[PDB]
Amino acid sequence: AVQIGFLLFPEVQQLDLTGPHDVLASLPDVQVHLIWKEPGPVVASSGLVLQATTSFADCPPLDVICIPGGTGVGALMEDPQALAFIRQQAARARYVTSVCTGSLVLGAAGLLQGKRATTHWAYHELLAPLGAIPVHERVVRDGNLLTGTGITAGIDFALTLAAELFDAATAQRVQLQLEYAPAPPFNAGSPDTAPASVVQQARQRAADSLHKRREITLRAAARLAA
Amino acid sequence: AVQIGFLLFPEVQQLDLTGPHDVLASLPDVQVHLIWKEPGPVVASSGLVLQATTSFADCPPLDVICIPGGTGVGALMEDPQALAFIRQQAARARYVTSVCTGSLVLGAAGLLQGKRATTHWAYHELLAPLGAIPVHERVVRDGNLLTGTGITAGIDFALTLAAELFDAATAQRVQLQLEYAPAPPFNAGSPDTAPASVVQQARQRAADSLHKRREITLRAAARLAA
Questions:
Q1: Given the DSSP bridges, would you call strands A116-117 and A95-99 parallel, antiparallel or unpaired?
Q2: Looking at B27, B64, B100, B161, which residue is catalytic?
Q3: Around Cβ B212, how many Cβ atoms within 10 Å?
Q4: Using N-to-C axis directions, what is the helix angle for B153-165 and B168-177, rounded to 10°?
Q5: Counting beta carbons within 10 angstroms of the beta carbon of residue B197, is it exposed (0 to 12), middle (13 to 18) or buried (19 or more)?
Q6: Using an 8 Å Cβ cutoff, are B90 and B5 in contact?
Q7: Which of B168, B183, B191 sits opposite A176 (nearest CB)?
Q8: Secondary structure class of B146 (helix, strand, coil)
Q9: Cysteine sulfenic acid (-SOH) (modified residue): where (chains A, B) (predicted)?
Q10: Quick one: which of A85, A158, B16, B114 could link to A20 by a disulfide (CB 3.0–4.6 Å)?
Q11: What domains appear along chain B, each with residue ranges and CATH number?
């Protein structure tokens, strides 16, 4: 069975995780793990309570690891236990993936050094200090690394993974079974397409978080420099 | 605060729920409830464990009710407690919504009689016996009823609801904050666009479930006829 693991941490953006989880869990001969320091409840940033299924110590070697984003990313960027786990799994995984600000965690772990990557538009400036080559595209692949943007990036890239792990027909069948054919009623999902006034409001609301994450990023970069 | 409730039941398709939940929970002055017969763990069809936050008896009057789909829909279609709750909330809700096979539950509750509605493509034949006017469109509105197809229908219609409950700028801001701009790597999300061989495989895999749901639907329709 293909072993797929998601890191589940306090203050995760749950949809970053729950989207690809439901897609990948639809495939034959896959086992999906929700990983944290111990099994038990973990609260997402919305207050939704999820349940981790395995600890770092008990997790099997993964074929796919996926790091979601969320408010809670700041803490993870300085969690040496979590970073060590990610590095250990990444060494042998067939695919190392992230959604949204999850790529900042990969960055803190040292896994973006010299790699093309993306992250959430409001935090994109934080990639370069972590050694990445920043790319403004929705899905960026570099070898076995796949970083994506958007709360539902993992749904889209899960279909890519399905096609490569199995075959295109299998990916198409899952898409059809899920009747997955999005059609957003607005076109404001990028700072390049949203109205300027909306971009300003979003930027202002992110400013405190960005400031705090600048500080964290610099400490994380210092650790990589050592 | 706008009160939004999701029915959370065993064997739910969790993404049907978790998608709109994360979008709507991003809005100011909203409270989101996960409703079942009592608070506590509820297991989704993938094995993901979620937590209901309130009981039927304690739930406040809702402004929006949303019924997700999933394997577990068959049981709900004959759960008199659940159906009575849905009817009670629907009487005063500003919006009555469903995702995927959740519309079959609205049908069993009597809420589709004479109404235009959709459901999952493989189960679409079950709408007419429940009194609906079947429509092959991704989102169907009829008065305050909104039924959608696709595992992520609720993400898209949550943006519509945001715009009507608040304003378009607010919906656009949430879309931008979430960087929501899907781009599926395949085009097989409808039986009209998928390859015929894929449609056949999907139909065959749904056949047992459809057969069982035909039986349930006829019993549910008999109750409506009384």
A1: unpaired
A2: B100
A3: 11
A4: 140
A5: exposed
A6: no
A7: B191
A8: strand
A9: 100
A10: A158
A11: 1-226 (3.40.50.880)
Contact B30, B55 (CB under 8 A): no
Q: In 3-state terms, what secondary structure has residue B4?
A: strand
Asked whether A89 and A123 are in contact (CB, 8 A), the reply is: no
Token readout for A195 is: 């109205």
Tokens representing A218? 């610099």
Interface test with A, best of B32, B103, B151 (most A CBs within 10 A): B151
Cβ-based contacts of A201 with chain B (< 8 Å): 169, 173
Query: A100 an active-site residue?
Result: yes
Say which amino acid occupies A209. Answer: S
CB-CB under 8 Å, B177 with A205: yes
Which residue of the set A27, A44, A99, A100 is catalytic? Answer: A100
Which of B173, B181, B191 is the closest to A202 by Cβ? B173
CA A58 to chain centre: 22
Check CB contact of B12 with chain A, cutoff 8 Å. no
> For B28-132, where are the E strands, in sequence order?
30-35, 40-43, 49-52, 64-67, 95-99, 116-117
Instruction: Suggest the residue from A121, A136, A172, A199 to mutate for an interface test with chain B (most B CBs closer than 10 A).
Output: A172
**Which residue type occupies B2?**
V
Method in brief = X-ray
**Helix pair angle (A14-24, B14-24), 10° resolution:** 160
Residue pair A131/A222 in contact (Cβ under 8 Å)? The answer is no
Retrieve residue B32's tokens.
Answer: 């989101």
Q: What are the backbone angles phi and psi of residue A6, rounded to the nearest 5°?
A: -115, 135
Length of chain A, in residues: 226
